[PDB]
């Protein structure tokens, strides 16, 4: 049932945000030690768990970009597209609120101790606990290219890993492998844009952060062109390119 699938997409997208935003909060306001690979693998494995938990019900999209791509290249029912996307964004938003609720005291004490005014340009760093912001050395277009390229890779390898006509079928290994994939994408490109590669994963938490006191910078990142647009559209375009590329360069040869 569609209602059941939306609930699963809501929970699954929320789960991956819980683990992902959770470890970044630990890093930023709890003083926990994590390198780039550690934060990346925790997020990737968290996604794997979200898939194992929802694959049997909704097919585990947990990403607006994947939903749209599966509709354009995998015959996914277009009538379930928007319900899926709303469920995903809502799930991400709620999980972000939940993580903030559990780490509540650490955020304030950290802001007090380091004299950080929530909502100021300098608070964009802590807002980074919930969503992504560009590296100081790159611009809007540069960041857009990164998100596009990585989501194309994301979609392409997801189809490859779940394509039973490509080499030996992965079976129950698929979700795990998809998580490991997300881990290497995050570790190799994360310093540039935080590798959002998922509109719901970024927008939902940004809306929460906006409501929780970070204000307008939660959306703009303090840049001339509102940054939120990159994590919102870059992945959608990328996922489409990736799906197309797989069927044309790899599928058409299997």
């Amino acid at each position: 049932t569609l209602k059941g699938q939306c609930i699963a997409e809501f929970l699954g997208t929320g789960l991956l945000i819980f683990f992902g935003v959770g470890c970044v909060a630990a890093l930023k306001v709890a003083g926990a030690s994590f390198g780039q690979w550690e934060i990346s693998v925790i997020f990737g494995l968290g996604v794997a768990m979200a898939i194992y938990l929802t694959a049997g019900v909704s097919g585990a999209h947990l990403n607006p970009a994947v939903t749209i791509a599966l509709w354009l290249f995998a015959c996914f029912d277009k009538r379930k597209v928007i319900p899926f996307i709303v469920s995903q964004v809502a799930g991400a938003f709620c999980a972000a609120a939940l993580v903030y609720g559990l780490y509540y005291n650490l955020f304030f004490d950290f802001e007090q101790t380091h004299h950080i005014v929530r909502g100021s340009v300098e608070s964009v760093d802590l807002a980074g606990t919930f969503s992504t912001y560009p590296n100081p050395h790159i611009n809007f277009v540069q960041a857009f290219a990164v998100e596009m390229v990585i989501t194309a890779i994301l979609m392409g390898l997801i189809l490859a890993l779940t394509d039973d006509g490509n080499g030996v079928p992965r079976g129950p290994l698929a979700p795990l492998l998809i998580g490991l994939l997300i881990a290497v994408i995050g570790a190799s490109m994360g310093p540039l844009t935080g590798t959002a590669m998922n509109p719901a994963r970024d927008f939902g938490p940004k809306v929460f952060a906006w409501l929780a006191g970070w204000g307008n910078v939660a959306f703009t990142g303090g840049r001339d062109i509102p940054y939120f647009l990159v994590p919102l559209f870059g992945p959608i375009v990328g996922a489409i390119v990736g799906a197309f590329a797989y069927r044309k360069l790899i599928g058409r040869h299997l």
Copy 2:
């Protein structure tokens, strides 16, 4: 036989404590380098091994909260509940004593060198080698919420990973995946409460620490409200919520 199952629960719960408490002792009194993810994955993988070693005999609960939940939602024989719980707590207690026995000299030399009086408020840090204590910035209720939420997630994903009616059956991958799950829970929430999520894993070692010289603070954590109550009840409530939620939101849709 019940006697055989209790022995398995005793050994399995003891195994996961050996590895878990072992690496924390290495971190605290042996100067070994470990980040938050490293200590968490070692504990998670250790749990996986404990499951592979006991699944075929007792079903590998190794956690009072899981035993109680499987009794309320999985038709587990209520006559085996208490025997299982006593075996689990006893196993955790003995493994803690074993780890202390092997690291014995390092504890004393560390306390001597850093002028730490065992049993004082400041010794709660080393007592943390055996069990969990709250982050300095959060209170009793806050810590209770964390343990509840994470154990609900723990139970929910355990049912999902072992549910052959949900997506492609995991088979022998299940225990490993459950260990990886524990790893991401510990890495994303560990800075808050040490992610006990298991009454036997926390209480047994606390009793040992109490007997080994840490005294009353082993139980209270040096807080107004004795902390041990959180790791004791928070997980039980959480496991129940998690089991219920899985069958209602995911099971009823498979």
Copy 3:
């Protein structure tokens, strides 16, 4: 079709370079924290993904040394050898350009801040983002021995992991295991030569770096004997020794 296989070899070799060179760029010009094991496992897992993505089409060589060895000991069609090698080198070259394009600004800002003249001997460090260079304490012959030994091990274990007549068949685990293998080779020997073990992985990116401003040192490493020859021939010789050794010492006993 050969055309389809060349495309797959081009994409697969390009993928492993994207992830590999990507994380090193993060380390060198983005200030990301990675230990030796982290950079090594990211590269190994990246290779695994490249295999899952191309195994069903070309058999996933993604390495000139492996192609040549499979031709000499696995009956691989010699008519596909050169097309495969050209595809591999081209793929590696393009992925290197792509990574440089995404990290563009960080390279220049880093060179400006640290007063590094691209093309000078001291820029060999940053050129190391794309390919391999010898440890300061070893010479040409010493580096040649390392690459030979590790590629022999690489080839030998690849045959062992994909040999269904050796123990229980790995099935879909094979690519993952091959990635983990590459990870341990890189972590245990990487400080010596960067463990190239693949002519295309090293030469293609070196040509790009040469074109991108690093000049002649990209090829020589600033050494009397042009270093590029080691990563070029050491692996080919090694792969052959490894293949031979497997069939004679392990295969002939199965």
Copy 4:
């Protein structure tokens, strides 16, 4: 054939030493960054590869303690025991020489720079590249207890992971899981004795180090009672206890 099996045991034991001693050399004389978990997982995964490479031929003992235990509790042919042990020790010795050969220059330059006299008490640290030595805070008996306990755990879980009558058969996952097991044992207890848990893994390299200039301290560790005896006998006793315990406490209940 026995000759073929001895060759496999020689290569497999040599492989695990190559990776293991290799990464420690990187840590000690090449300045590579590795935490306790990283060095431990590299060694564990290296063992897994050694098993995948030799399981089909010899059954992959790669450890004198395991060979002796399988003879006493698994009906292993006693006529193959000594040939297996000699092959294992020889393999470990040769791999140690090989790693020293590749890192040759770094050892000398490090000793020159830090003014270390090879063979002196203070050189025991570098000798630790090849084999194990006790933590400064524990004595002979204490170290003996550690090796005994961990090898008992090692043997017990190896039987459990390879016992098709215990839960769902692991199949091709077994070797990997055994490697992960070795990883958690090394990470949780490594700071105490270096977790040798294998007579060949320790003695062979100690003999090499003795011959390579470290002299008598390679065997004694600079202690009153020659340390080499612990890694030599502690594991044998432990493996026997572990095998017995598994069949009595877990097997007899399956």
